[PDB]
Amino acid sequence: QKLIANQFNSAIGKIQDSLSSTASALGKLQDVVNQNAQALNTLVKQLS
Amino acid sequence: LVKNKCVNFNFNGLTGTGVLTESNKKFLPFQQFGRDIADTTDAVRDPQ
Numbered sequence A: 001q002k003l004i005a006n007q008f009n010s011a012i013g014k015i016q017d018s019l020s021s022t023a024s025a026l027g028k029l030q031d032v033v034n035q036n037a038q039a040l041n042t043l044v045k046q047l048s
Numbered sequence B: 001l002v003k004n005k006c007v008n009f010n011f012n013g014l015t016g017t018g019v020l021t022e023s024n025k026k027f028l029p030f031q032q033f034g035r036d037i038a039d040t041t042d043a044v045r046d047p048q
């Protein structure tokens, strides 16, 4: 149990860095947003 | 001329419906109408 406590609590420790130091972490979600803002922006340029 | 109120405007034959406001945009002497991403006229220069 103690050995797993250290291994678990350290594992959650690494997630922070992998999230904060890497922009590609959310690259799925950031694309889901960058598709709509891409689709609407193009839909406005169509007026030209 | 009416500023800051919804009006039906004719400027140099360009017609439409807008809210005429002041602006700091600076046209070179030969430019008359400004245009937008949608090419709908954003800014005009008061002729008189």
Ligand SMILES: *[C@@H]1O[C@H](CO)[C@@H](O[C@@H]2O[C@H](CO)[C@@H](O)[C@H](O)[C@H]2NC(C)=O)[C@H](O)[C@H]1NC(C)=O
Residues within 6 Å of the ligand: A003, A006, A007
């Ligand atoms: C199982 O592996 C863990 C680590 O994967 C071992 O725990 C490490 O033991 C060393 C001592 O050799 C320490 O320097 C580390 O700090 C320990 N890590 C943790 C997270 O406690 C553990 O000793 C291994 N057990 C067996 C039976 O081999």
Ligand SMILES: *[C@@H]1O[C@H](CO)[C@@H](O)[C@H](O)[C@H]1NC(C)=O
Residues within 6 Å of the ligand: B047, B048
């Ligand atoms: C139009 O006439 C007014 C006065 O009647 C004058 O102030 C104005 O300068 C004239 N238009 C232009 C573009 O100068």
